[PDB]
Design a protein around this ligand. Structure first.
Ligand SMILES: *[C@@H](CC(=O)OCC)[C@H](C[C@@H]1CCNC1=O)NC(=O)[C@H](Cc1ccccc1)NC(=O)[C@H](COC(C)(C)C)NC(=O)OCc1ccccc1
Ligand SMILES: *[C@@H](CC(=O)OCC)[C@H](C[C@@H]1CCNC1=O)NC(=O)[C@H](Cc1ccccc1)NC(=O)[C@H](COC(C)(C)C)NC(=O)OCc1ccccc1
Lengths: 180, 180
C-alpha cells in the first residue's frame, strides 16, 4: 500500500523513457545530470529521452574491485536541467525484503507497477553469459522491455531490473556509494 | 499516462480485496451494495472483504439470453455503507481498444497496475471447460490470484479479468445494463 505511493512519486519525478540503438528502457535520474541504465542498454552519444534527443557526455560501465560486471551504466546527460537528487533514497548495500515494487515506464509498458514479493541477495549470476555480481533476485515479472525498471520498497530504491529467466527476475543493486 | 491515473482513483475508491473459500480476488463495488466477482470465485453467505467478514445477501451468476455463461457473479453485500456509484463509467457494450490497464489489488499482489496493450472482442471461449461468452482478449498478464482484476481505459471500466493461458488474458465484459 505505502510502497506503491512512494514508487509513483519517485517515477513521476525521476524516471524517463529511454530509447537506445538496442531497445526501449526505463531510466532513473539520480542527481545533477547523472542517470542510470542497465549496462546492456549501451547508450551512444545521443539517446532519445521521452521522445527527445539528448546528448550523453559520459557513460561509465560499473564493475567491482576485481573488474566483475555489475550490469549498470551511469550516464551523464548533456542537458541543462538537473535531476531531483535522490541519493538519500538509495540503499547503502544489497537489500533483502519480503515485499518490493518493480516500476517500469516505457511507451510500450507505460505506468506499470508490479509487486514482486520476496527479494533476496542472489549474489553471483551468469547473466546472458556474462559473470555478474550483486544481483537481487525476485519471483514473477520477466519480459523483454522491462529492463531499467526500478525496484523499490517504501522510502528506498533497491535496484534496477536487468534480466530474468522463467518466473525469476534480477535487479542490479543500486548502491548509494556508486554516486559521485 | 492518463489511463493509469483514472485506474488508481477507481481502485482507491471502489475496489477491495476479497477472500472466498476458493481463493483471493479483486472485487469492484458498483453502486449501492452491489459488487462484482468472477463466477468461479463462488462467494458464500460470508466473505472476507479487506480482512473483515461481510455478509452476502444475494449472489447472481450472470448468463446471456440463451443461458450461456458470462463468468461474472453480482453480489449484494449485507453492509450499511454504500459504494460510490460508478455505473456511469461502465461500457455499454464489448469494447476494443489499443491500450488498456489491468488493475489487480490483493494481499498477495497489492497495487498492481499492468498496461495490457491491445484488447479485442474475442467473443466465445472455452474457458476452463466452460462455454463462455463476451470475452475480451489481451496479451501479457496471466497468473493465479489476478482474477477480478479490473480492465480499464481512461474514463471507462471495460471488464473483469477471469482467465488466461500462456501470454493471453481474458476479461468478462462489464456491461452497464447488467446493473439494476
Ligand atoms: C531486459 C532488457 C531487454 O529487453 O533486452 C534488450 C537488450 C531483459 C529482461 C529479461 C528478459 C527475460 N526476462 C527478463 O527479465 N534483459 C535481458 O534480456 C538480459 C540482457 C543481458 C543482461 C546481462 C548481460 C547480457 C545481456 N538477458 C537475460 O535476462 C537473459 C535472457 O535469456 C533468455 C533466453 C531467457 C531470453 N537471461 C539469462 O541469461 O538468465 C540466466 C539464468 C538465470 C537464472 C536461472 C537460469 C538461467
Ligand atoms: C484467476 C482465478 C484463479 O486464480 O483461480 C482460482 C479459482 C485465474 C487466472 C488465469 C490462470 C492462468 N492465467 C490466468 O489469467 N483464472 C482461472 O484459473 C480460470 C478459472 C475458471 C474460469 C472459468 C471457468 C472455470 C474456471 N481458468 C483458466 O483461466 C484456465 C486456466 O488453465 C490452466 C491449465 C492454464 C491453469 N484457462 C483456460 O481454460 O484457457 C483455455 C484456453 C484459452 C485460450 C487458448 C488456449 C486455451
Amino acid at each position: 500500500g505505502p510502497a506503491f505511493e512512494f514508487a509513483v512519486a519517485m517515477m513521476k519525478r525521476n524516471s524517463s523513457t529511454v530509447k537506445t540503438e538496442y531497445g526501449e528502457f526505463t531510466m532513473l535520474g539520480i542527481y545533477d545530470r547523472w542517470a542510470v541504465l542497465p549496462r546492456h542498454a549501451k547508450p551512444g552519444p545521443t539517446i532519445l529521452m521521452n521522445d527527445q534527443e539528448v546528448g550523453v557526455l559520459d557513460a561509465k560501465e560499473l564493475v567491482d574491485k576485481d573488474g566483475a560486471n555489475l550490469e549498470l551504466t551511469l550516464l551523464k546527460l548533456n542537458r541543462n536541467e538537473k535531476f531531483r537528487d535522490i541519493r538519500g533514497f538509495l540503499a547503502k548495500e544489497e537489500v533483502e525484503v519480503n515485499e518490493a515494487v518493480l516500476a517500469i515506464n516505457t511507451s510500450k509498458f507505460p505506468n506499470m507497477y508490479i509487486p514482486v514479493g520476496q527479494v533476496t541477495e542472489y549474489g553471483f549470476l551468469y547473466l546472458g553469459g556474462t559473470p555478474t555480481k550483486r544481483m537481487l533476485m525476485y519471483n514473477f515479472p520477466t519480459r523483454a522491455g522491462q529492463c531499467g525498471g526500478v525496484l523499490m520498497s517504501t522510502g528506498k530504491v533497491l535496484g534496477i531490473h536487468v534480466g530474468g529467466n522463467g518466473h525469476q527476475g534480477f535487479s542490479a543493486a543500486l548502491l548509494k556509494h556508486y554516486f559521485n
